[PDB]
């Protein structure tokens, strides 16, 4: 299977053994349009191509609700712009970006009378927040700029994968985690 008729899933293995189970490349299908019901069942969401989850996160804000065909086109162009600069498999750079963008600690009240305490983010939530943060940083970046959505999405993934704080998603992870360390 070559996603966008160009990229295999053979070398795409997640190094993070805590997050590897919830990221799946086995179900990948050229063109991330599988109409499989992810809403059904508590953890069927986990068994979904990571690239399709990104294609579902991309279509937000209402003015762009439901247009998967346009989102997956962006994912292909973004992957080409990641291949063009990183010079690595872009499905594998996304896998590293999802792994890093996910914070491991959050703040919730915990049966307190507004006093939040430290909690541990679940390994599914880490994957869901990570992808959501990648797409929302790009969304905000391309709102009023000549820079296309594809270019900013390509750059957040490239920045997250290393861990550069320029990524809106990694800044969010460090803010969430730090509030969790103090509310500990």
Q: Which residues bind RNA (CB under 7 A)?
A: 35, 37-40, 58-67, 69-71, 73-74, 135, 138-139, 142-146, 148-150
Six-digit token string for 167 = 């990524």
Return the range that interacts with another protein (CB under 8 A); candidates 73-81, 100-108, 159-167, 175-183: 73-81
Question: Strand, coil or helix: what is 30?
Answer: coil
Question: Strand, coil or helix: what is 24?
Answer: strand
Taking the CA of residue 177 as centre, how many other CA atoms within 13 Å lie in the half-sphere pointing to its CB?
13
Question: Strand, coil or helix: what is 148?
Answer: coil
* Nearer residue to another protein within complex by CB, 76 or 103: 76
Contacting residues for 146 by C-beta, under 8 A, at least 6 apart: none
160 close to 169: Cβ distance less than 8 angstroms = yes
- Residue 152 gets the label, from left (phi > 0), alpha (psi -120 to 50) or beta, of alpha
Partner in contact with 63, chosen from another protein, RNA, none, beta carbon below 5 to 8 Å by kind: RNA
Six-digit token string for 23 = 């990221």
Q: How many chain residues bind another protein (CB under 8 A)?
A: 24
Return the range that interacts with another protein (CB under 8 A); candidates 104-112, 143-151, 162-170, 173-181: 143-151
C-alpha dihedral (16, 20, 26, 32), degrees to nearest 10: -80
* Nearer residue to RNA within complex by CB, 14 or 78: 78
| Contact characters 82-121, another protein, x per CB under 8 A | -xxx------------------------------------
Among 44, 47, 147, 184, binds another protein (CB under 8 A): 147
Residue 41 touches another protein, criterion: CB under 8 A: no
Among 15, 115, 146, 182, binds another protein (CB under 8 A): 146
- Per the listing, tokens 């010079």 go with 87
Partner in contact with 114, chosen from another protein, RNA, none, beta carbon below 5 to 8 Å by kind: none
Q: Quick one: which of 52, 84, 44 has its CA closest to 71?
A: 52
User: Interface residues with another protein (CB under 8 A)?
Assistant: 5, 29-31, 33-37, 69, 72-73, 76-77, 80-81, 83-85, 146-148, 150-151
């Amino acid at each position: 299977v070559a996603l966008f008729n160009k990229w295999p899933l053979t070398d795409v293995k997640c190094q993070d053994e805590s997050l590897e189970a919830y990221i799946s490349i086995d179900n990948h299908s050229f063109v991330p349009h599988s109409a499989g019901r992810w809403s059904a069942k508590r953890f069927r969401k986990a068994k979904c191509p990571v690239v399709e989850r990104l294609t579902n996160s991309l279509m937000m804000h209402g003015r762009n609700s439901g247009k998967k065909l346009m989102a997956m086109k962006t994912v292909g162009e973004a992957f080409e712009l990641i291949n063009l600069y990183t010079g690595k498999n872009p499905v594998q750079v996304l896998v590293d970006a999802v792994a890093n963008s996910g914070p491991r600690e959050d703040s919730c009240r915990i049966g307190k009378g507004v006093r939040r305490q430290s909690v541990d983010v679940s390994p599914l939530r880490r994957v869901n927040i990570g992808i959501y943060n990648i797409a929302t940083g790009a969304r905000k970046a391309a709102f009023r700029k000549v820079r296309p959505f594809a270019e900013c999405l390509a750059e957040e993934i490239m920045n997250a994968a290393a861990g550069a704080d320029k990524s809106y998603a990694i800044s969010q992870r460090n803010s969430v985690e730090r509030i969790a360390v103090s509310n500990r």
